[PDB]
Amino acid sequence: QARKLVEQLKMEANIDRIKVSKAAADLMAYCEAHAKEDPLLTPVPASENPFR
Amino acid sequence: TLSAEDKAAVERSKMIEKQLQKDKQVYRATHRLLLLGADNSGKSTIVKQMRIYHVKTSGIFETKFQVDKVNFHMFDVGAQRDERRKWIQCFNDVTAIIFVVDSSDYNRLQEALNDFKSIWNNRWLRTISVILFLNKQDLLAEKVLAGKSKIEDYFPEFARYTTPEDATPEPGEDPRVTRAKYFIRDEFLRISTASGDGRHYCYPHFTCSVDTENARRIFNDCRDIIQRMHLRQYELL
Amino acid sequence: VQLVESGGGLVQPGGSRKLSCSASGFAFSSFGMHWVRQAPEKGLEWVAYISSGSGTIYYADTVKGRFTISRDDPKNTLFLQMTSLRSEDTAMYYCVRSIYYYGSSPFDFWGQGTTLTVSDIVMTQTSSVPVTPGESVSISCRSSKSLLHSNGNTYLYWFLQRPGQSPQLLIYRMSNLASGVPDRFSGSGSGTAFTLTISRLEAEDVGVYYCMQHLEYPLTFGAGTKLEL
Amino acid sequence: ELDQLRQEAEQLKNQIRDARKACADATLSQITNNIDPVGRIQMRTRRTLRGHLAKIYAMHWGTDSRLLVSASQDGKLIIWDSYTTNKVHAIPLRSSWVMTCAYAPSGNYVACGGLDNICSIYNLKTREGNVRVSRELAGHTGYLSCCRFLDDNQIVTSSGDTTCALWDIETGQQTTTFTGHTGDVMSLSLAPDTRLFVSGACDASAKLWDVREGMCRQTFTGHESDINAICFFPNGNAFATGSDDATCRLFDLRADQELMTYSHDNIICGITSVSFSKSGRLLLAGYDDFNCNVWDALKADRAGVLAGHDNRVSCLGVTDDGMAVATGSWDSFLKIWN
Amino acid sequence: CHVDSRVDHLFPPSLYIFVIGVGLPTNCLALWAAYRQVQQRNELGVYLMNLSIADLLYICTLPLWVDYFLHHDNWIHGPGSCKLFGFIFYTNIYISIAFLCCISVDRYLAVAHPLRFARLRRVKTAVAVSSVVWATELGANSAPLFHDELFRDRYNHTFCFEKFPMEGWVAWMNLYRVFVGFLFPWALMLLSYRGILRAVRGSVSTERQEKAKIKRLALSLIAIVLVCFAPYHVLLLSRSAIYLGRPWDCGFEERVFSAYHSSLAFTSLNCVADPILYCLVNEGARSDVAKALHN
């Protein structure tokens, strides 16, 4: 019954974690390397969008 | 200014809009209502009688029946879990909710009242009326007459209660039975009148599972609910 | 699917006859249909067109006033009415199936045809080419007007006719490959310049080739390029 | 003993909290104290798509960024052409209480489900011209809340009972069943690599699953109420959640923790839909107070507001090329913003 | 005939000025509220918009009549203007009464017979009925357009649409007006509201304090229509009946001249009473009006 519950939580304990500063930087880098290819940050000129 | 192929695509999209306008008429002329109850409550037998006239893990059942040439669809959720707070949101446009409750339990009756309270005070089920069926009146009458089990050992307020002046006894029934059957009804109405605010209403009825008049009662009660909505829509009150 | 038609015969000049095609195996009511004809030793020519819902009926220049088209959806049969026949109406008539929505492939299925005998964006095609197994062929047909519409898609269609059989679709809109045809077939081109390329040729694909336009009615065909082994 | 095992689990639980505190060194708000604000984003309605007869509960985009499928509680799936606003297909359903919809990446199939406990797969490309039911999947004991394709022969579903399943469409069976939740599961999001997915249930917890093994690798807590929507950041290393406490949160898979809370005091109503933009800079959320809202995914400042709906927003999606955003509401309308 | 009045250049101009000032903005607001209702698939918006449009045309045509009355009954502008403006001014009353009757019958079908007659409570059928009403009312009152309606007289005056005594074809048109454009629609309105009250008085879920409100509203509508339109039609019928007996006797016209113009001036308060009783008396439309004014 409850025996299986203890084992399941053991697996999550043995993991390799990293620092929040490292993880925060990676999110920052991805957003600052695909900014140009985002038609909602910067509106695209007309005759190029298919809706307007 | 459109090509031959793009001109024939609009024509296809106009034969779809025509068929979707023939379904708005059937949708608007049919009334949807939801059936709720417990396991001991005889909500299955009501379905059988109403169908008899007029997959193993399936979670929804539907019944068709019409009275005086108006169509009615009844829905009964059957295979879902005990928690209810998430799939009720899909039923905030129905005409009415039918709440069928047993009256001969006397020990599961308290759990029935709490269940009625949650439906009445839901955030999504406002402006939705409730048609409650106080089922199994045949068994209740026998129990009180025999007097083996009392109704005063689960609700001490019974001793101080007297039959209301607005009663309507059936022909030839012991006044003790009338006093009992109107006490249970008043418990449910105390919840209804606490927080109604005039947006929705509760319609009581005494029923037995073998009765053939259940279809007529729903039709009469629904005719009142649509009427009330039309007074607001057509700006009369 | 199957389309079987009947009604052909001998018809004296100035007479009249009725042609009917029976449909079985698909959603007839949601599909528009065409009529095409083929002379005894010549190419194809469009005749009529009835749309889904019978809201759009077009006729060819050599057809208006004399021919009448009609369909019967519940009975799954369409009728062609012929009046005042002449000597230029001797041909084998075909019935063709077509649907139109985003991404559709019109001119999919072609019937067996019926035999009858009596007692404009011009498309130019090339009349023969030698065929040796293993080689790569290229067939080109040109057009008198640009077929590249403003939306972005070009309306050129390619068909193949093996000896003693009905035509079958190969390529639609100049770049798309039909359903059920091998991947060796390929098509490409630009405005007013088209070509069809076949790589690693194998037997059982010799015959005549046709290129069709669909930018605006009436639909125009080509003379036909013949490949012989 | 049972109490000793719980005490052992509690001691094991105390270990996990220690690891989270140790790896915390700063905040995302602190590291984002120099990036220039996005500013203000003006979205305006380009198309309004009329035709549905009742409330709209589900919506999915195609891979071609032009075709769109929607579900309503009237018994219809409509496939739209966004550019022209004309209808391609109209599929009548056997059941009418639909709650989810999906569009196959290849483009051949669509899927739907609801209170009928059944996931139905339709075939859009047949020799005849009509759409047909190709497979009905049964085996759940509760209403389906989400369904997503992996290829033409695999699908993942989440249901009212606290389970999710992987299916083989041709056979019709359950390859793997994922267990470990304690409440109704309300959402799923497949990773871009299609080898992991995240589910959020009505117990204030989100979990990460491996598709080819069947185990839960991480458990994420921090909310207080039900979680209604979940999605991945377009990188595979973060996901965002929406709940009924009028807050959204962002989690990281490699340093399991919370990073930002998107909350404001004027709004009290819950979140019904969550999605990102193509670059991961905008996080869009739909609310119960009849209007959508736009957030900046690195500063927690409201950048814009989409307000054109007369009732609650239920579904919300962003196209693959990132040129449009579609919103559906209970007023039976879809609106495309740009 | 010899007619004069010491009141005709005092009361009608002032009442018309009041009617313009109070009923132009209110009718605009009522039209906006009706547009909001028709956006929400409610078919009572079509009739409300048409009523507001008729009222607006009447308001727009009033100022020339203000000048006409201020100039001691002289029209100066021209014959074609007389024809057009007089036609609108003497016709809009019956458009208004017809659309009131349509609203009443729609409410009766909605309240007294729910669960039936769903093909008649739609927007398309409302548009069809409204167009038929416009065509029929503009085609049945078009008899004046085929005559001459500018007459000078020996005693320093020039009328527009009215002559004293009447020509002879006017009496029959007046009798048609009194008995077909006023009494019949009013009778339909009364019967429909009586039916609505009869159906409401036997419904549970409506307390006494709401039935009282419905009763007061219905009685108010009937009473205001009657009080606005009755004196004019009584005097019109009196003139028409007395003319056909003694055409050569013009004492009655000399005696009832002032009462006549003032009644014809009094009939205009319906254009102010309709927006109040059909838009600004319930909270739902008042909220929409306030929200619109907020922007």
PDB file of N, CA, C and O in Angstrom, chain E residues 12 28 33 45 61 67 93 112 122 153-155 160 177 196 206 214 220-221 240 250 272 282-283:
ATOM      1  N   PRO E  12     -48.878  76.456 -29.687  1.00  0.00           N
ATOM      2  CA  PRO E  12     -48.209  75.452 -30.517  1.00  0.00           C
ATOM      3  C   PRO E  12     -46.720  75.714 -30.677  1.00  0.00           C
ATOM      4  O   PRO E  12     -45.930  74.762 -30.590  1.00  0.00           O
ATOM      5  N   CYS E  28     -32.538  59.881 -29.987  1.00  0.00           N
ATOM      6  CA  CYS E  28     -31.240  59.355 -30.406  1.00  0.00           C
ATOM      7  C   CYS E  28     -30.759  58.262 -29.455  1.00  0.00           C
ATOM      8  O   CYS E  28     -30.300  57.191 -29.886  1.00  0.00           O
ATOM      9  N   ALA E  33     -30.085  52.371 -27.919  1.00  0.00           N
ATOM     10  CA  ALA E  33     -30.448  51.233 -27.077  1.00  0.00           C
ATOM     11  C   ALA E  33     -31.098  50.125 -27.895  1.00  0.00           C
ATOM     12  O   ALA E  33     -30.824  48.935 -27.684  1.00  0.00           O
ATOM     13  N   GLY E  45     -35.943  44.980 -30.843  1.00  0.00           N
ATOM     14  CA  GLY E  45     -35.118  46.091 -31.271  1.00  0.00           C
ATOM     15  C   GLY E  45     -35.511  46.644 -32.623  1.00  0.00           C
ATOM     16  O   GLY E  45     -35.376  47.845 -32.864  1.00  0.00           O
ATOM     17  N   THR E  61     -39.154  67.699 -38.986  1.00  0.00           N
ATOM     18  CA  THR E  61     -40.079  68.512 -39.771  1.00  0.00           C
ATOM     19  C   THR E  61     -40.788  69.597 -38.959  1.00  0.00           C
ATOM     20  O   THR E  61     -41.385  70.496 -39.558  1.00  0.00           O
ATOM     21  N   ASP E  67     -42.636  78.090 -37.577  1.00  0.00           N
ATOM     22  CA  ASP E  67     -42.687  79.360 -38.300  1.00  0.00           C
ATOM     23  C   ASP E  67     -44.079  79.636 -38.863  1.00  0.00           C
ATOM     24  O   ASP E  67     -44.576  80.769 -38.784  1.00  0.00           O
ATOM     25  N   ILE E  93     -48.016  60.009 -37.029  1.00  0.00           N
ATOM     26  CA  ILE E  93     -48.796  59.520 -35.892  1.00  0.00           C
ATOM     27  C   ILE E  93     -49.184  58.061 -36.094  1.00  0.00           C
ATOM     28  O   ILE E  93     -49.070  57.231 -35.179  1.00  0.00           O
ATOM     29  N   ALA E 112     -47.872  35.115 -23.229  1.00  0.00           N
ATOM     30  CA  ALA E 112     -49.077  34.308 -23.100  1.00  0.00           C
ATOM     31  C   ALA E 112     -48.942  32.928 -23.718  1.00  0.00           C
ATOM     32  O   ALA E 112     -49.510  31.967 -23.190  1.00  0.00           O
ATOM     33  N   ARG E 122     -38.529  36.256 -34.626  1.00  0.00           N
ATOM     34  CA  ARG E 122     -37.195  36.272 -35.205  1.00  0.00           C
ATOM     35  C   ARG E 122     -36.907  37.650 -35.783  1.00  0.00           C
ATOM     36  O   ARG E 122     -37.803  38.485 -35.925  1.00  0.00           O
ATOM     37  N   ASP E 153     -56.789  82.910 -48.882  1.00  0.00           N
ATOM     38  CA  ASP E 153     -58.146  83.243 -48.550  1.00  0.00           C
ATOM     39  C   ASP E 153     -58.310  84.704 -48.427  1.00  0.00           C
ATOM     40  O   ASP E 153     -57.355  85.417 -48.253  1.00  0.00           O
ATOM     41  N   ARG E 154     -59.528  85.167 -48.508  1.00  0.00           N
ATOM     42  CA  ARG E 154     -59.754  86.573 -48.496  1.00  0.00           C
ATOM     43  C   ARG E 154     -59.261  87.253 -47.251  1.00  0.00           C
ATOM     44  O   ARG E 154     -58.711  88.328 -47.340  1.00  0.00           O
ATOM     45  N   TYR E 155     -59.415  86.652 -46.087  1.00  0.00           N
ATOM     46  CA  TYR E 155     -58.973  87.307 -44.863  1.00  0.00           C
ATOM     47  C   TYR E 155     -57.507  87.169 -44.468  1.00  0.00           C
ATOM     48  O   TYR E 155     -57.207  86.732 -43.374  1.00  0.00           O
ATOM     49  N   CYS E 160     -51.768  75.320 -45.316  1.00  0.00           N
ATOM     50  CA  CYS E 160     -51.032  74.200 -45.892  1.00  0.00           C
ATOM     51  C   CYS E 160     -51.613  72.910 -45.335  1.00  0.00           C
ATOM     52  O   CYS E 160     -51.533  72.666 -44.127  1.00  0.00           O
ATOM     53  N   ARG E 177     -59.382  57.667 -41.157  1.00  0.00           N
ATOM     54  CA  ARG E 177     -58.329  57.836 -40.163  1.00  0.00           C
ATOM     55  C   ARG E 177     -58.840  57.516 -38.769  1.00  0.00           C
ATOM     56  O   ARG E 177     -58.295  56.638 -38.095  1.00  0.00           O
ATOM     57  N   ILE E 196     -51.840  39.620 -21.553  1.00  0.00           N
ATOM     58  CA  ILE E 196     -50.576  39.490 -20.833  1.00  0.00           C
ATOM     59  C   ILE E 196     -50.812  39.489 -19.330  1.00  0.00           C
ATOM     60  O   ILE E 196     -50.252  38.661 -18.601  1.00  0.00           O
ATOM     61  N   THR E 206     -43.426  34.677  -9.274  1.00  0.00           N
ATOM     62  CA  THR E 206     -43.522  36.123  -9.417  1.00  0.00           C
ATOM     63  C   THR E 206     -44.324  36.657  -8.241  1.00  0.00           C
ATOM     64  O   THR E 206     -45.521  36.374  -8.126  1.00  0.00           O
ATOM     65  N   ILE E 214     -46.042  45.379 -13.261  1.00  0.00           N
ATOM     66  CA  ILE E 214     -46.439  45.079 -14.636  1.00  0.00           C
ATOM     67  C   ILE E 214     -47.795  45.704 -14.946  1.00  0.00           C
ATOM     68  O   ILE E 214     -47.997  46.299 -16.018  1.00  0.00           O
ATOM     69  N   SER E 220     -50.386  52.389 -17.807  1.00  0.00           N
ATOM     70  CA  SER E 220     -49.770  53.657 -18.174  1.00  0.00           C
ATOM     71  C   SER E 220     -49.624  53.785 -19.682  1.00  0.00           C
ATOM     72  O   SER E 220     -49.916  54.845 -20.249  1.00  0.00           O
ATOM     73  N   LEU E 221     -49.177  52.720 -20.352  1.00  0.00           N
ATOM     74  CA  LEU E 221     -49.034  52.785 -21.806  1.00  0.00           C
ATOM     75  C   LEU E 221     -50.371  53.077 -22.480  1.00  0.00           C
ATOM     76  O   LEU E 221     -50.486  54.011 -23.295  1.00  0.00           O
ATOM     77  N   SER E 240     -66.044  66.250 -39.383  1.00  0.00           N
ATOM     78  CA  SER E 240     -66.396  65.446 -40.547  1.00  0.00           C
ATOM     79  C   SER E 240     -67.882  65.115 -40.564  1.00  0.00           C
ATOM     80  O   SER E 240     -68.530  65.172 -41.614  1.00  0.00           O
ATOM     81  N   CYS E 250     -71.003  77.298 -41.743  1.00  0.00           N
ATOM     82  CA  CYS E 250     -69.609  77.390 -41.326  1.00  0.00           C
ATOM     83  C   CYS E 250     -69.471  78.049 -39.960  1.00  0.00           C
ATOM     84  O   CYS E 250     -68.442  78.661 -39.663  1.00  0.00           O
ATOM     85  N   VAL E 272     -42.268  62.455 -27.155  1.00  0.00           N
ATOM     86  CA  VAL E 272     -41.463  62.599 -25.949  1.00  0.00           C
ATOM     87  C   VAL E 272     -41.783  61.444 -25.011  1.00  0.00           C
ATOM     88  O   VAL E 272     -40.899  60.926 -24.318  1.00  0.00           O
ATOM     89  N   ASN E 282     -36.705  51.125 -17.711  1.00  0.00           N
ATOM     90  CA  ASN E 282     -36.123  49.894 -17.198  1.00  0.00           C
ATOM     91  C   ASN E 282     -34.619  50.058 -17.018  1.00  0.00           C
ATOM     92  O   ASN E 282     -33.986  50.899 -17.661  1.00  0.00           O
ATOM     93  N   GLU E 283     -34.054  49.244 -16.124  1.00  0.00           N
ATOM     94  CA  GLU E 283     -32.652  49.413 -15.758  1.00  0.00           C
ATOM     95  C   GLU E 283     -31.719  48.911 -16.853  1.00  0.00           C
ATOM     96  O   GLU E 283     -30.611  49.435 -17.016  1.00  0.00           O
TER      97      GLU E 283
END
